[PDB]
Structure formats: C-alpha cells, structure tokens
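Regression check, VLB case 1159:
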Amino acid sequence: FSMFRYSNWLDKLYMVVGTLAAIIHGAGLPLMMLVFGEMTDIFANAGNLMNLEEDMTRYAYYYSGIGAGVLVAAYIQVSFWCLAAGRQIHKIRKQFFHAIMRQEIGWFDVHDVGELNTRLTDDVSKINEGIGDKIGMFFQSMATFFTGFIVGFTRGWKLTLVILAISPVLGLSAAVWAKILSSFTDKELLAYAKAGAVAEEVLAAIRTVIAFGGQKKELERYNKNLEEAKRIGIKKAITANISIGAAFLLIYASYALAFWYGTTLVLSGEYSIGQVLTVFFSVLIGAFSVGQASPSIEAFANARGAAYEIFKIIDNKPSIDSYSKSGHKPDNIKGNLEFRNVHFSYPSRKEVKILKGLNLKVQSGQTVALVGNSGCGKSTTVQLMQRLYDPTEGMVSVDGQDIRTINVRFLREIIGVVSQEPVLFATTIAENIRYGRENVTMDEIEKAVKEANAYDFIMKLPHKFDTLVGERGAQLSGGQKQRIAIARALVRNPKILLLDEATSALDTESEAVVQVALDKARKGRTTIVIAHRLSTVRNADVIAGFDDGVIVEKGNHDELMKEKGIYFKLVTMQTIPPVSFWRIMKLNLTEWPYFVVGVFCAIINGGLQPAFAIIFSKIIGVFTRIDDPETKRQNSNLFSLLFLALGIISFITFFLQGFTFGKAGEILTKRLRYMVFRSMLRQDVSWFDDPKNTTGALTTRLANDAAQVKGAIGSRLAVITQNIANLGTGIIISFIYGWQLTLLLLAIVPIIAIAGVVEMKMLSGQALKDKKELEGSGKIATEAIENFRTVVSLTQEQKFEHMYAQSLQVPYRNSLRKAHIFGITFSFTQAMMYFSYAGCFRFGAYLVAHKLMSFEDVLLVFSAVVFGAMAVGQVSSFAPDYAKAKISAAHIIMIIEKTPLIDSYSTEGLMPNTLEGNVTFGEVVFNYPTRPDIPVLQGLSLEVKKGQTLALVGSSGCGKSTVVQLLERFYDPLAGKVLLDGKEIKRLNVQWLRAHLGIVSQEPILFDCSIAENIAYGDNSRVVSQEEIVRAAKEANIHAFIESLPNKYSTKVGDKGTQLSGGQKQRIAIARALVRQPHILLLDEATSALDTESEKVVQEALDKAREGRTCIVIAHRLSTIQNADLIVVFQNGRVKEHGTHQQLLAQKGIYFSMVSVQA
Ligand SMILES: CC[C@]1(O)C[C@@H]2CN(CCc3c([nH]c4ccccc34)[C@@](C(=O)OC)(c3cc4c(cc3OC)N(C)[C@H]3[C@@](O)(C(=O)OC)[C@H](OC(C)=O)[C@]5(CC)C=CCN6CC[C@]43[C@@H]65)C2)C1
Ligand SMILES: CC[C@]1(O)C[C@@H]2CN(CCc3c([nH]c4ccccc34)[C@@](C(=O)OC)(c3cc4c(cc3OC)N(C)[C@H]3[C@@](O)(C(=O)OC)[C@H](OC(C)=O)[C@]5(CC)C=CCN6CC[C@]43[C@@H]65)C2)C1
Ligand SMILES: Nc1ncnc2c1ncn2[C@@H]1O[C@H](COP(=O)(O)OP(=O)(O)OP(=O)(O)O)[C@@H](O)[C@H]1O
Ligand SMILES: Nc1ncnc2c1ncn2[C@@H]1O[C@H](COP(=O)(O)OP(=O)(O)OP(=O)(O)O)[C@@H](O)[C@H]1O
Ligand SMILES: [Mg+2]
Ligand SMILES: [Mg+2]
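Current build output:
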C-alpha cells in the first residue's frame, strides 16, 4: 500500500498542481540567495570605490518579484494539498462507515465494538494528518535541497564540494545522537515502568493498604524506585542537551571552515565574496532541508498502516450481503416457517455446536413457543430465524421458499423482533417509533401506541412526541421501554413476530395488555415466544422442547403434559483549576543553585546569535574595505577561528545549561511524585471510590507528570531567558550601529516571528480542534456501532448512514475553509519574509548612498535582527508544549494541596490504654458518597459486648460489608453514634483504631512479595519476628501448607496470586489478619469458595482466640449461625431480628425462612 489515494480522479488536479507549486516554492529560496550573492558583490564593489540607487532598486524589484512568486506558490501548494486531503478523507470516512454498517453480525461479534469505533474516530484523522500538509512540505523541502545543490555547483566549483563533504559527517553525527537519545528514552521508560508497576499494585488495593496502614512501607518502596527513575532521567536530559550542543558545534565548525576556504580562494583571485556567500548559504540550506523533510515521511508511513487496515475492512465481502438487491423479493408471503435439520455453531466458537439438527414447520396464524433448560438455544434459534446468521448444516425456508433465496433486506423488513432487553435510540419517542418504518404517519404512531397500551405513559410525560431518550431523557421504565419497542415492532406491520423475555418484572397488567395485543396480531401474524411465565405457555398454540440442541417435545401443553416430558417437569417446577507561574514555582527550594546557572547559560546562548551576526558582518566588511593589504588574509583567518570558539562555547554552555536545567526538573519529579503519592494515601477512601480517581487515571497522573511540570517551569524559564537575551541584545546592538534600518527591521520583526511559529506548527499541530467536530458528528457512529444488533434487526441502517452523512457534511465545508485559511496564512508569512529582504536592503542602499552607514553596518543590523527573530521563533517552538504542561501542573497542585476530612496522617485522637471492646451503633444512618440520596443505612443499630461472637445475616447485597467499612471510618456516618468502649469513635486515633481492628475483605488482596513478608505486613510499626509469624500460621493452620511448597514461604507470589490457589489465599489472608491479634475481628464471607474443612479450621482458630476477641461475621452458610454468640439480621437498612439463634429459630420468620430455603 503505497498509492492509496483512490478517489475523485478530478481532485487529482489538486494533487499534481499543488505539488508543482511546492516545487517552485522549494526552489524559490536558493534563487533568492543567488541574487543575494550577486547583490552583495554590488555593494562590495561599490563600497570599494556613484550609482548604487538604481542597482539596489532593480535588485529590490527582483526580490519583490520572487516574493510575489512565493506568495502564489506557497498558497497554491498548501491550499490545494489540504483540499485534496479533506475531500479524500471525507469520502473515505463515508465509505468506511458504509462498509461497517454492511458487515455481518458474526463479524461484529468477533471484532470488538470499541476498537472499531475508535478506529473510525482516530485512524481517519491519522490519514488526514498523513497527507496534504506533510506532502507539500516534503516536496518543497526536497525541491529546496535539489535546487540548493544545483546552485552551489553552478556558482561554486570547489567550495560546494568541501561543503557537501562536510555535510555527511554532520548527518552521521546527528543520526548517532538521535539513536543514543532514543535508547536512553526507552531505558528510562523501563526504569520508571518498574516503579509504575509498584504504584499500580499498591493503589489497586488501596482499601487493604489503608486498612492495615502500611503507608510508610509503600511510600519507602516508591521512593526507592523513584531514585533510579531520577538517575536515568538525568542521564537522558544530559544526553539530549549534549546532542543539541554537538549539532551547534558541527554547524559552526562548518561555517568557520567554509568561510576560511572561501576567503582563501577569493583572496586568490577566485570568484568574488558574493559568490562564496551564495554558494555556502544555498548548499547548507539544501543540506538541511533534506533533514527538515523527515517529519512528513514519518507521518506518511504512519498513515500507511491506518490506510492498510481501513481498506482491508472496506474491501471485505460478507456472504450475507445486507445491501445486495439481487435476491428474490416475494410479495404474497403466506406465514409459513420450515426448518429442516437446522444445525448451527456460533462463528466465534466454531468447535462448540449449539444445534444438533432440528426439524420444525410452523403454519400461518400459529402461536409457537420454545421451552428448555438453561442454554437451550432458543435465543440462537430466533437469531437464526431472522436470517442474521446462516445455517451451518440444514435448511430454513419461509412460505416454502429458502430463506437465503429471498433478499436479505426484504426478509428482514417483514420480521418483527423484540429482545429481552430492548433499548431506545437517544432521540424523540416519535423518532424512535418512526425508526420501525419510514413511510409511517403520526396517525399510524397513535394507532400503534394505543395498541401497545402506553397512551397514558406518553400523555403523562411532557412533550408526548418530543421527549428525547438521552441523558435523563431515556428515563422511561423497563415496562415503558418494552411497550415502546412493541409499538415499534407493530408499526413495522410485520408478518412474523418473535419475542423473548417480553415483560420480565413490573406489573403483569402491562404484560396482560402486551399479551392481548400479541394475540390480536397473532390472528394474521405468525408468532414465536420465549417466555418463562406459565400463563404464556398456558394458551400457546404449540410448545417445543429444545434440550441439548435437540427439539423433542412436540404438541400442545396438554399433549406434552400427557407425555410427562420436560414440559410437565418445567411447569411443575414453576409452582480547569486556575494556575499561575508565581504560585507554581514550588521547585525553588531545590533550584537556588541551579536556576542561577541555568539563566546564566541561557543568557550566554541568547547573546551567542548577535555575536554571530557581529562576526558575519565583520567578515563581509573585511572585503568592502578598499585598503586591501595582505593583512586581510590574516584578518579573515582570525575571524574564521572565532567562529570555532563561537561554536565551542555554545557546546560547553549547553552541556552546563542542560545539566542545571535537566537535573533540576528531574529533581522536581523525585519530589513531586513523592509528594503526590504521599498526599494520595493521606486521604479518604470515598475520594478513591469516585470515578475521577480511577487506578489508571491515578497512575497516568503520577507517571505522565514529570515531563509536563519540568517543561512548564524549567523549559519556560530557559526559553524565555534565551529569547529575551537574544532579541534584546540584537535590537540594542543594531541601534548602536545604525538607527533608521534598525527601526525598519524592528517594525518588520513580528511578522517574521509569526511566520516562524506558524511554519513550525504547520507540520506538528494541523488537527487540534477538528476532533471536537468529529466527536460531535460521531454520536451517530457510536449509536449505530454499539446498538448495531437492533439496527440490523429492524433494518434502519440507511437512515443512520444518511444521518451520519449530514452530520459529517456539517463540518466538511468548515474543513475546506480551514484549509484555505491555513494556505493563505502560510503564503502571506513566506511572502512577508521575502519582502523583508527587499525593503531592508533598499532602505540600506538609500542610507549608504548618503553615507548614513557602511555596508558592513547595514548588513550587521539586518543579519542581527532577522536571524535573531528567526532563532527566537525556532527555540520558542522547540520547547515542550506549555499550555498542557501548565494544566497538568495545576491539576497536580490541586491533588497535592488536597486535605482529607479523615486526616489519617493526623495523630490527634484519644488513645486510652487497652480497650473494653464494647461496640455500639445507635441510629447509625449513612449512604455512599457516590450516591448519597440512595440509603445504605436506615437507622440500624448493633450492640456488641467484649469478646462477643456476633453474626450478621440478610439478603445478599443488602449492605453487610457497609457496616464493616464504616467500622474502619472509611465513610463517615450521616446519623447515629458509633462508639467503642463507650467513647467517641471519631474522637479516637484514626490510625490507632485502624490498627486495633482487623478485617478480612470478601475478596482479600495479596501483594507480589514473599509469603513471610506479606503475612508480616499485617502489623506495621514493628517487625514481627519469625516466631510470631510461625505461631500465627499454625493458629490459622497453613504453616504446613507453606512449608510443603518449594522454598517454603520464600516463594514469590505469581501475578494476581498466580502461584497460590485462592483456597490457600483465603487462609493466608486469615493468618495475616490474625497476626496483629486485633481487639475486634471482622470476617465477611470468610468461607468463600473453599473446602468445608478449611472453614472449620478457620472457625476453630477464631473460637480458640475468640475469647477476649470480639468478632463480627458475615456469610451465606448457616453453620456460622449455629455457633454465633448472638445474631442480627439487616432489613432495608434496619435490623429486624435480634437475639440468639435458638430464640430466632423459635420465632419462625426471616431467620427460619432463610434456614429452610438454604437447608
Ligand atoms: C523552524 C523549523 C526547524 O528549524 C526545522 C528543524 C527542527 N526544528 C528546530 C530545531 C533543530 C534542528 N537541529 C537542531 C539541533 C539542535 C537544537 C535544535 C535543532 C533542525 C536542524 O537540523 O537545524 C537546522 C533539525 C532537527 C532534526 C531533524 C531535522 C532538522 O532539520 C534539518 N531531523 C528531523 C531530526 C534528526 O534526528 C533526523 O533524524 O534527521 C533525519 C536530526 O538528526 C539528523 C540531522 O539526522 C536531529 C538534528 C539535531 C538529531 C537529533 C535530534 N533530532 C530531533 C529532530 C531532528 C534532530 C531544524 C524546527
Ligand atoms: C516564512 C517562515 C520562514 O520561512 C521560516 C525560516 C525563516 N524565514 C524564511 C527564510 C529563510 C530560512 N533560511 C534562510 C536562509 C537564507 C535566506 C532566507 C532563509 C529558514 C530556512 O532555512 O528554511 C529552510 C530558517 C533559517 C534559519 C533558522 C530557521 C529557519 O527555519 C527553518 N534558524 C533560526 C537559523 C539557524 O542559524 C539557527 O537556528 O541556529 C543559530 C539555522 O541553523 C540551525 C542551527 O537551525 C539556519 C537554517 C539551517 C542556518 C544557517 C543560517 N541561519 C540563520 C537563520 C537560520 C539559519 C526558514 C521565514
Ligand atoms: N456470539 C456468541 N458466540 C458464542 N456463543 C454465544 C454467543 N452469544 C451467545 N452465546 C452463548 O451460546 C449459547 C447459545 O444459546 P442461546 O443463548 O442462543 O439460547 P438461550 O437458551 O435462549 O439463551 P439465554 O440463556 O442467553 O437466554 C448460550 O449459552 C449463549 O450465552
Ligand atoms: N464503590 C461503591 N460505591 C457505592 N456503593 C457501592 C460501592 N460498591 C458497592 N456499593 C453498593 O453497596 C452495597 C454493597 O453491599 P455490602 O458489600 O456492603 O454488603 P453485603 O450484604 O455483603 O453484599 P455484597 O457483598 O453483595 O455487596 C450494594 O448496594 C452495592 O451496590
Ligand atoms: Mg435465551
Ligand atoms: Mg459483601
């Protein structure tokens, strides 16, 4: 795939013409230098002696002409190329969505929905970035390179050879530097990936860590990793700065050598100095445009893969052509389905066969139904019924004709399908119903909604035919949604209607009306029903028993019952923070002996450019002086050597300039992370529960932060320093040497700087705000791709595609306008730069002709100002992006400055010696901070005495774990008092309490460490001797299990407990909890899924240690209730049953009912 631009042959006119324009623009610059060379000679000749006004004026005319030529050529290239890119991208996006909507259902099953959606959303943008702007830039760069070498050879015979001989050395050195930088970057990536794995492991189990209060250990480990992270980061920054310095040094060495040799030759009577100027400038500019081209080829290579994938999808041909119009289109469709030996297997799992052959004939006006055990395949049966799939081995026909023979669209349009969980499109209810059929009028909608028995629901909500189905728009009830879907199906005027789990839950009266309407449609429409309610099959015209992919039962309900088949058995069983640089300089603490050196080096570097202008103007002036003794040679030689120094110093300072800055930033990282992380732990778990603080989000903020803030502070300061130094020094020194020309160039500078920044951003940031419009239009794509099943079911694909086309045409013209605007901007910038030469040198000719200054002086001012503006633009655009960095810095400032309500880091809390162990919850009422309105506690109460075996029971999911979580003060209680030993719980030491108690989660978490260390992790603040760990393990009865394993406890835990089985993992967790010997123990489903003997051993250990050790127990096994000292049952946030197990059993009810159900 190298030629994938494959649309709008006429648009190819833009492709070539723009390219052509690029060529000339690329060639424009060396030509401009050519004349400049000759131009200089004129001055050098004229000063060596007058009619300079006319010659200067005609050269300025040449410059203006070439400038206008560029003003046309650059605009043409950029505009035309972006036009072609935009048009092709629009066409390919339309075709891509069209192809996706045409794919087969099984293909969607295999291919991830989110991957495909993000593919559409991002790869098209990648292709857009891979053509238009970048291609124009590449062609212009290559043209500039070629033309520069051509000019060098033509006007230069020996100097060009030496320059082009030096160039490959520069190329090799730069490539080596880039490779070294990439290697260092990858090594640092891995080095920090270590610490990042550690951070992920600690954060993902924040509940356990905060419960055990192991904050210190985790923080110490993270600091340990951060040390190596910082070391390698410092190495990387040093290497990057040294590479920059080496590039500078090589460039200035080339300058020195070229001017040395050219001065030698010209002193030897060779071509004039102007010839040297033109040849050197042109050759170097070409030999650096060659490298300037590379980003474009990188972008094109990137886009090649996206194009490959997208075209591979597009060219895919599906067997079930949902769009093919060649299929038969029967009209007199008498209701009749006939499946013969129908065998099927899901394409995702071809090995597993669901249907093992099936025969079934259903005649017109028949109510057929399917019944079977779990996995009976009824759902797959109906799916294959609508022709969504094809029969693996068998045949299916409608009205006596094979299903395949008929057109897929025609067959689909005559089949109503209602799933077990319909969802409506996020739009108006009228639109949702209209999606059933296009040619449907509001009267038809009224009739359908009346039939579905929902007119009251529609007329109750405001905007009957206008209520949207978006966020809070689609708040309709499940029954209301089912009614809406039924109405949609009815509006389809289908022949065959299939339904499954029609009206699960909710009032049956709505189910009654739904069934009545379905029966009324049954008068003429064949029906298939997958319903669990007995009444559904009570009047069913026929019921078929699908078990193990075999249809056995055949007959009415009475007939099947008389055979005592599975039907009878089933029936019986039924029975944007604000930031600021002043407030953001938190690194000054570790920056005082660093920022001073940084600013010093930056000042030196900035002044370096005006020094180069001084030397350049002096060298040129060494030949405009008429004295012309032999000393000129020496003079030139001397100046040449200065370049080398002007080069060498540049490297040295840079080596220091990075070392103070690169290190500084790195240092800041080692603080900021160690601060950020340190702040994260000292926080309330509620904050973690929020979706904003997802583990991935926290690790991204804690990892993709160093470079951000480092840039925002250090790089901003350094770039600003260098910019101000360079430009201010240039302006001042220009004013000293000449006034009028300095004023004119000062007037022109801002245009040059704007042009430089825009050119630098041309190849980087072409698509920034387009993503907004793309997302705005992509709601349709997300709808269709996510909900594709219903879309294909009711054949609404065409309307969705047309809607997408409109939504995409909304920004299409905007994209074309953006293309034209960018082209005009770039072209005007280039032309303004070219006119700068003409204006400045014409004014200089005027000045010199009146002895206002020496040509050396005007050249000095011109070079100083122009090159200063261009270099300041370049260095400003080379820095890492600031706005994103400032935003990230502000975000992390918010994170670090955040102070928790439960200051676990705070040591303020009553710490009485020992504890009585009486836990009292009175009118305890609280709700999750995520959903405070929904109550989790309803004034529940619980009184527990010292060493009292308390058991908690209730409906699964009632909020049992909520009480345990509150015991750790993870979430504050809205109402009621929680007291330990008759004391204010909140008034106690939060850390002291969290250490005193002990809790085993319903799903204990184990860190990747040695078993001994993991067990000892339970009790922090003091190393637990191996004897204590062994005793605890024996108490939990796992010591033998660990000793059996190789290396004993010394085994390294596999990822996610890979090495150890969950059964042993739960026992290990129990041992860890018991190690601390907590005053109060909390076990939540401690039995879980394990051997009953393991639960017996754990209970025996707890009972042995139970005395003087209060316990709270939750589980779904009744055995735990037998030995409970006291029992309690939670009911809707209120404890209903209180007392002993025997007393509760005698008072038959919730406890007795639960025991009977389970037992
Ligand atoms: C205003 C446009 C521009 O100036 C165009 C280039 C990139 N930037 C400016 C900064 C810049 C350039 N060179 C610098 C040296 C030190 C400090 C800064 C620079 C610029 C150049 O050569 O000067 C005219 C340049 C830079 C590069 C550059 C090209 C380039 O213009 C010639 N390449 C894209 C890379 C580079 O790694 C590469 O792979 O070349 C194919 C390249 O090495 C070479 C020459 O091979 C080089 C040169 C320093 C090596 C290591 C770091 N990478 C990052 C990008 C790359 C550079 C010029 C913006
Ligand atoms: C309309 C935007 C723009 O085209 C962007 C630049 C500046 N001007 C256009 C004219 C221009 C540029 N170069 C010219 C040479 C002679 C005459 C005119 C030019 C421009 C370029 O090279 O486009 C390919 C450019 C030029 C430079 C340029 C950047 C640049 O844009 C790519 N650099 C700022 C300097 C430069 O010397 C420097 O930054 O180091 C001190 C730079 O060398 C390095 C290390 O990049 C370089 C270009 C290779 C080298 C030798 C002479 N110095 C003086 C100015 C500087 C240049 C391009 C306006
Ligand atoms: N794309 C798929 N690929 C493979 N198996 C699938 C796929 N979709 C579903 N299955 C499973 O394959 C089996 C096919 O049975 P099917 O679900 O059609 O019948 P069912 O008894 O009506 O199902 P259910 O219990 O979901 O109501 C089920 O276990 C189903 O969960
Ligand atoms: N992060 C959370 N934020 C808010 N509510 C939550 C969160 N996690 C779970 N819940 C809700 O809290 C209740 C959890 O019940 P809890 O675990 O406390 O008791 P349980 O009887 O052991 O039940 P289960 O183990 O099924 O959750 C459920 O309502 C669940 O929806
Ligand atoms: Mg099913
Ligand atoms: Mg629970």
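Comparison notes: The two ends are 68 Å apart (CA to CA). The chain has 42 helices and 20 strands. No diff flagged against the previous build.
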